[PDB]
Amino acid sequence: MFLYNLTLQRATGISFAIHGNFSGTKQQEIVVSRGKILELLRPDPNTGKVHTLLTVEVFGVIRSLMAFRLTGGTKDYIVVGSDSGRIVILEYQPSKNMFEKIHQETFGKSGCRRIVPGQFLAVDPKGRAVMISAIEKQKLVYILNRDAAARLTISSPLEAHKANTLVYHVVGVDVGFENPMFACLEMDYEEADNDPTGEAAANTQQTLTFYELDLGLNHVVRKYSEPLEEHGNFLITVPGGSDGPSGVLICSENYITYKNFGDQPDIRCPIPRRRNDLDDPERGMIFVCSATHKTKSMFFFLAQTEQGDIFKITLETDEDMVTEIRLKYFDTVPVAAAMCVLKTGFLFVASEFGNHYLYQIAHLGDDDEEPEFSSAMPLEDTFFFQPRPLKNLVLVDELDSLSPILFCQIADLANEDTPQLYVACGRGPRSSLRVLRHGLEVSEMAVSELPGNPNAVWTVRRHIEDEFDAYIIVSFVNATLVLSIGETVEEVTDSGFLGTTPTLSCSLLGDDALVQVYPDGIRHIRADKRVNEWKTPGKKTIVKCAVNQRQVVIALTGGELVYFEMDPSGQLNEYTERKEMSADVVCMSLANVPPGEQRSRFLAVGLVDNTVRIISLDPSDCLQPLSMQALPAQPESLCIVEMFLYLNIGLQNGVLLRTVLDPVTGDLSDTRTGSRPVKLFRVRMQGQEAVLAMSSRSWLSYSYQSRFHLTPLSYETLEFASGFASEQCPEGIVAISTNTLRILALEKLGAVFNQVAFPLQYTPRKFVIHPESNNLIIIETDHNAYTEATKAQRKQQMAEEMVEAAGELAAEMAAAFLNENLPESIFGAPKAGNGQWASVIRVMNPIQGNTLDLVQLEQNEAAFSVAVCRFSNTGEDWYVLVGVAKDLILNPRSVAGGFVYTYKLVNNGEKLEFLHKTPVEEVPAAIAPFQGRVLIGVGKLLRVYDLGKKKLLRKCENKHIANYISGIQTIGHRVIVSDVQESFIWVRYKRNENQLIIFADDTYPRWVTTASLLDYDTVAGADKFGNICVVRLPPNTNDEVDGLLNGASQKAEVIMNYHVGETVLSLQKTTLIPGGSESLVYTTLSGGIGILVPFTSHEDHDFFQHVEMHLRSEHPPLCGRDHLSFRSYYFPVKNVIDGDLCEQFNSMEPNKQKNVSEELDRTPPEVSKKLEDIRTRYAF
């Protein structure tokens, strides 16, 4: 078994984010880090849209990301520290649209290690030094310089090691062109390892250490070190030099401190709390991120707490000394991992989970009545504020993000033919269930259905410098109707066409000269009201034409090729030659004559002959055959297009062809994507050319910087369309349906899935599908959470206690505190308690989003497993079983017990009714229907259970599973068990002896997250550490059993090992496209979706193996990682080809593409076609 890995949807979770002038111009861009992907974004200051410019797979783990600029430069660099032992410096090249590696410096071994630097990265604010640091003793400093050609030079590292030391955070300090300084939060643990009493562990303080780099003497020295009051998280650089003092802000538990070396005293400010907070009073408050905004007049900071409250921090200063810290409540947004404040007044919020946000900073300065807290204010007792809806910010853009994906099911729950992806994702009150469909989403522009026989509609403007169109002309079978956009579009008279007979061609001939072609001829219309008409000789009638704003070719009966042209005079002149051939045309197309040239030469001619003929039309060799190529079937239309020149061949079936424009065909690609004739129409996507193919389903064909995409749309069949433009929306489509006249639009920048979302209450854990009604039964559960009833009674308690505060009892804030509940999706849920849980069972319709039934559980009960099944001793009734833990503590682990609930699932799968509740002595983590009964994993125990009248009846039990059952899967005869730390146990159920016997196990420890059965002998598994494996039983395996490694007697073999780089939580074998092949689809915690597909021949496997081998050397990973070593992170790779490395061939430069291709005995286009074939065989 040999597998090929493909990514269908990349990760969308953000870890780090930096901003700067990375292209060298005055506009600002953001560089975000996924887990293993680097990405450049640019928000538009005109519309507020965030566009993705570049995204690269780095094949490593990015751990720290900084931006810096040399003095006198206008371009920002990128410093990356990763899980390799290298520091890398990158530069964005706007003209090539790629990241160019400038420097690489190796300092240690690879991997996320304790003492090898790469976790912390600081840079001097003037850009002359950079510090890379590990969590332990090792720190390195590089000096950055510049030569006379203005290129960046790097020096050899300087060591600043210090044994038995832990680092919390490092930042560079802003000095005024003095010696560079670095600040560190450090802790010494030497004394704590020598005291058995445990008192040296306590009484141990953090220190704030300052490291000075002396560029004159070329060494790093410890200058200052001071013990702190309590332990603090990250540090903040205060802008110094000539704009501001030069110190640090220490963020801590419940406090924020300013500190500077010299004669400056320490200044502390306590963090304000929300008035009438519902969270556990024992919990403290920390800041989670920060954002600095420097202006040539002043500066301030933006810090956010764990509740999602952003405060605005300013600093009250003297000539050199700081006197006060002032805090003011700014706004409430979701908890972010990073915040970027952009010039032109934009705030970018990258959340830890879920969608990301871009805000417009609407209110500058602060003219408000809300109180401003200070460090000078005396308090014995803490500050209090009231959270409110957004006042300083306005929401401008929202970027979708599937992180974190927790459960997935691929199924056809609607009655389409293509399956949809049902994804339980999100955490807390921002969780949701999302339905993903392969296609694009058609935006509604306009609808007005008119009775008649619509056939075609053009959108032609009156001028060529016009951005406003002139008319739209929909032809009936008896007549036509031509309208204009007066913003109240209806009948129009002064157009000039007024066709009694239908209109089969409407073109902008001149600047304001229009060509109207109709079955009885052509009447050229002026800007003024004048018409020159050429009608039919006798009974020959045109059906097809080929227009262009310099030349117009027509087709009468018999293939009489008649070509016109309009020379700089601006009127008609027809050519002398009329070449006629055997049959009448069915298809032709004239390429849009570019402003560079005078006219178009190529004209593909498809006839009843079933052959494309290519013909010239320039005055030198106009209208004489050049090359003919037969067809597989009846063509309907073709079109020469770009985005370099291609043409497309539409058959009368739901299948397509393609041929690159040249005197000879050079490329070939056919996609079985219908039973209905393909209609090829002109449109404009991304402001450039694209072809809208139409069948029973309508597809959009567009390459994208060598990214060919044939993507369907989320609507049914149409019959004619073209581009659209108006004051309403200057870029769209005018599409026609049966008994309909529509205008549509497509506004999604190159995505593969469109999604709809339905909100939930808590973190979803697992859902099942009812087989009859196709309803979903979901369980949601959260830790540190209140139930609804506990929240209500806690709030009533707080009210009755605040009304008896022993004070005139004359003004009641309690009645105002009880009325309106602030929404938890915006302000967060009150996280209160350490062993407190909250769980819910929900019945949901997947077509709509409505909740059919909802069962709330008691306070400290936590659901972990769910199943829907039928019992043999009962009839055809359905039951729902829910496994629940009781008083679970996670660290140290402790649980009071467990329960199994049983419901009857009545009213056509819409209602749950309680039947009974069976106690168990441990957490039931897995429930699986099995042969008219049910298997339950109760902690370490595997049990069989039958349905009873008052509880569930234990029938069989095995007690030899190692640690903890996390999953159970059954194929008809056997049972597969997943252990939390051991990988897989095979069990057989003896039907007549009533015995569960272990007959096989594995030889590796695996932290299994999920498992999938591939056949009767093979299992696909996933891991907490990001690995996928396939395990198969040897053919010797004996099933009829009644240890050799302290285990089972027979072992299983590992036939596949792969490191993905992200934690997989869903595995499923399925077929994605209609008429395709089966693949293994997996899902990741960062929001990524991927497949593993098998090879069917040795030749494909060998070719792709050689491609991977040659691309491993000549196109190495960007951040210094070894590709083979990265995919062998925990186990060596076995029988997997990385198709994400292989598809990077299409993005190399032509010279290296030729060097790679000429070793495989092939050209780059053939390699590209071979790469596309295997992808389109399985996925999209």
Q: Does 192 bind another protein (CB under 8 A)?
A: yes
Nearer to another protein, 58 or 1048 (CB): 58
CA 48: distance to chain centroid?
19
C-alpha 691/C-alpha 689 separation (Å) is 7
Binding positions for another protein, 879-938, rule CB under 8 A? 890-891
Nearer to another protein, 958 or 1063 (CB): 1063
Nearer to another protein, 10 or 943 (CB): 10
Q: How far is the CB of 783 from another protein (least distance, A)?
A: 4
Nearer to another protein, 438 or 765 (CB): 765
- Residue 1062 CB neighbour total at 10 angstroms: 22
Q: Does 81 bind another protein (CB under 8 A)?
A: no
C-alpha 1025/C-alpha 981 separation (Å) is 12
- Residue 1047 CB neighbour total at 10 angstroms: 16
Binding positions for another protein, 422-441, rule CB under 8 A? 427-428
Q: Does 61 bind another protein (CB under 8 A)?
A: yes
Q: How far is the CB of 458 from another protein (least distance, A)?
A: 52
Q: Which residue has the tokens 């009368």?
A: 652
Q: Which amino acid is located at 660 in the chain?
A: V
Nearer to another protein, 36 or 886 (CB): 36
C-alpha 315/C-alpha 948 separation (Å) is 70
C-alpha 192/C-alpha 199 separation (Å) is 8
Q: Does 65 bind another protein (CB under 8 A)?
A: no
Q: How far is the CB of 249 from another protein (least distance, A)?
A: 16
Q: Does 294 bind another protein (CB under 8 A)?
A: no
- Residue 195 CB neighbour total at 10 angstroms: 13
Q: Which residue has the tokens 């919990």?
A: 283
Report yes or no: 650 and 680 within 8 Å, Cβ to Cβ.
yes
Region near another protein per CB under 8 A, out of 37-45, 198-206, 646-654, 663-671: 198-206
Report yes or no: 411 and 418 within 8 Å, Cβ to Cβ.
no
> Which residues does residue 459 pair with via DSSP β-bridges, in sequence order?
472
Q: Does 335 bind another protein (CB under 8 A)?
A: yes
Report yes or no: 1141 and 1108 within 8 Å, Cβ to Cβ.
yes
Binding positions for another protein, 123-152, rule CB under 8 A? 135-137, 140
Q: How far is the CB of 108 from another protein (least distance, A)?
A: 6
CA 9: distance to chain centroid?
7
Q: Does 195 bind another protein (CB under 8 A)?
A: yes
Q: How far is the CB of 765 from another protein (least distance, A)?
A: 10
Q: Does 496 bind another protein (CB under 8 A)?
A: no
Binding positions for another protein, 714-743, rule CB under 8 A? none
Q: Pick from 178, 243, 306, 324: which binds another protein (CB under 8 A)? A: 306
Q: Does 406 bind another protein (CB under 8 A)?
A: yes
Nearest to 327 by CA among 273, 264, 389, 399: 273
CA of 942: how far to CAs of 54, 264, 953, 966, 989, in Å? 51, 66, 14, 11, 11
Nearest to 594 by CA among 602, 584, 585, 606: 602
Q: How far is the CB of 154 from another protein (least distance, A)?
A: 7
Binding positions for another protein, 30-59, rule CB under 8 A? 35
CA of 1063: how far to CAs of 37, 602, 1028, in Å? 15, 53, 9
Q: Does 108 bind another protein (CB under 8 A)?
A: yes
Binding positions for another protein, 787-826, rule CB under 8 A? none
SS (H, E, C) 1000-1054: EECCCECCEEEEEECCCCEEEEEECCCEEEEEECCCCCCCCCCCCCCCCCCECEE
Q: How far is the CB of 938 from another protein (least distance, A)?
A: 21
Region near another protein per CB under 8 A, out of 237-245, 403-411, 439-447, 994-1002: 403-411
C-alpha 128/C-alpha 71 separation (Å) is 9
Helix (H) or strand (E) holding 1129: none
Binding positions for another protein, 976-995, rule CB under 8 A? none
Which residues fall within 8 angstroms of residue 848, CB to CB, at 6 or more apart?
none
Binding positions for another protein, 1084-1123, rule CB under 8 A? 1084-1086
Q: Does 662 bind another protein (CB under 8 A)?
A: no
Helix (H) or strand (E) holding 216: none
C-alpha 1168/C-alpha 1172 separation (Å) is 6
Q: How far is the CB of 199 from another protein (least distance, A)?
A: 8
Q: Does 489 bind another protein (CB under 8 A)?
A: no
- Residue 2 CB neighbour total at 10 angstroms: 19
Nearer to another protein, 338 or 905 (CB): 338
C-alpha 991/C-alpha 996 separation (Å) is 9
- Each residue 4-23 as x (binds another protein by CB under 8 A) or -, in order, gives ---------x-x--------
Q: Does 113 bind another protein (CB under 8 A)?
A: yes
Q: Pick from 95, 96, 198, 850: which binds another protein (CB under 8 A)? A: 198
Q: How far is the CB of 251 from another protein (least distance, A)?
A: 10
Region near another protein per CB under 8 A, out of 281-289, 339-347, 437-445, 789-797: 281-289
Q: How far is the CB of 1101 from another protein (least distance, A)?
A: 24
Q: Does 119 bind another protein (CB under 8 A)?
A: yes
Q: How far is the CB of 1063 from another protein (least distance, A)?
A: 4
Region near another protein per CB under 8 A, out of 88-96, 156-164, 390-398, 624-632: 156-164
Q: How far is the CB of 854 from another protein (least distance, A)?
A: 21
Region near another protein per CB under 8 A, out of 172-180, 388-396, 635-643, 780-788: 780-788
Q: Is 283 helix (H, G, I), strand (E, B) or coil?
A: coil
Q: Does 1170 bind another protein (CB under 8 A)?
A: no
Binding positions for another protein, 216-235, rule CB under 8 A? 231, 233
Nearer to another protein, 290 or 1057 (CB): 290
Site size with another protein, rule: CB under 8 A: 71
C-alpha 161/C-alpha 87 separation (Å) is 17
Binding positions for another protein, 828-867, rule CB under 8 A? 831
Helix (H) or strand (E) holding 48: none
Q: Pick from 52, 104, 106, 931: which binds another protein (CB under 8 A)? A: 106
Region near another protein per CB under 8 A, out of 628-636, 685-693, 1080-1088, 1135-1143: 1080-1088
Q: Pick from 204, 610, 773, 845: which binds another protein (CB under 8 A)? A: 204
Residues present in the chain in total: 1180
Nearer to another protein, 185 or 396 (CB): 185
Region near another protein per CB under 8 A, out of 106-114, 463-471, 475-483, 904-912: 106-114
Q: Which residues of 1023-1032 are buried (b: 16+ CB within 10 A; e: fewer)?
A: beebbbbbbb
Binding positions for another protein, 1019-1058, rule CB under 8 A? 1024-1026
Q: Pick from 5, 355, 763, 1010: which binds another protein (CB under 8 A)? A: 763
Nearer to another protein, 42 or 1024 (CB): 1024
Region near another protein per CB under 8 A, out of 153-161, 483-491, 980-988, 1036-1044: 153-161
For residue 662 the two structure tokens come to 């040249």
Reported for 861-864, long-range contacts at CB under 8 A and 24+ positions apart, including other chains, are 861/837, 861/885, 861/886, 861/899, 862/781, 862/783, 862/837, 862/888, 863/765, 863/779, 863/780, 863/781, 863/839, 864/765, 864/766, 864/779, 864/781, 864/923, 864/924, 864/925
Report yes or no: 127 and 71 within 8 Å, Cβ to Cβ.
yes
C-alpha 260/C-alpha 262 separation (Å) is 6
